[PDB]
């Protein structure tokens, strides 16, 4: 009763070496678990360039060409899921 993403990530063109963000703000009951996937695979933390900040913001520094793709916010709850994705083009 039950997860809504109120702000999700936004489609972007980003420059190589730059820094960009994936934001996700979710409500629900109970509090939803948030996870991020890129082209269907769960995003790394082992990558020093990719950091979890506060207020829903996942931040990616030193953009590479291979960061291009689809990034999905999945908000979960034993009773439901929501998803909100964006396409990031690094060039």
Binding residues for other proteins, rule: CB under 8 A, are 14-15, 17-21, 23, 49, 51-57, 59, 61-62
User: Is 37 or 61 the residue whose CB approaches other proteins more closely?
Assistant: 61
Whole-number minimum distance, CB 61 to other proteins, in Å? Answer: 7
- Pure H helices in the chain: none
User: Is 29 or 52 the residue whose CB approaches other proteins more closely?
Assistant: 52
Query: Where would I find the beta strands (DSSP E) of 1-91?
Result: 4-7, 12-14, 20-23, 25-27, 33-38, 41-42, 50-52, 57-60, 69-77, 80-90
Report which of 58, 88, 55, 63 is spatially closest to residue 73, judged by C-alpha positions. Answer: 58
Whole-number minimum distance, CB 90 to other proteins, in Å? Answer: 12
User: Is 20 or 71 the residue whose CB approaches other proteins more closely?
Assistant: 20
């Amino acid at each position: 009763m039950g997860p809504v993403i109120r702000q999700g990530p936004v489609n972007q063109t980003v420059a190589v070496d730059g820094t960009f963000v994936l934001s996700c703000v979710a409500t629900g009951s109970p509090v939803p678990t948030i996870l991020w996937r890129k082209d269907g695979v769960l995003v790394s933390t082992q990558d020093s360039r990719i950091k979890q900040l506060e207020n829903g913001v996942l931040q990616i520094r030193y953009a590479k060409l291979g960061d291009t793709g689809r990034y999905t916010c999945i908000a979960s709850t034993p009773s439901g899921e929501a998803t909100w994705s964006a396409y990031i083009e690094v060039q």
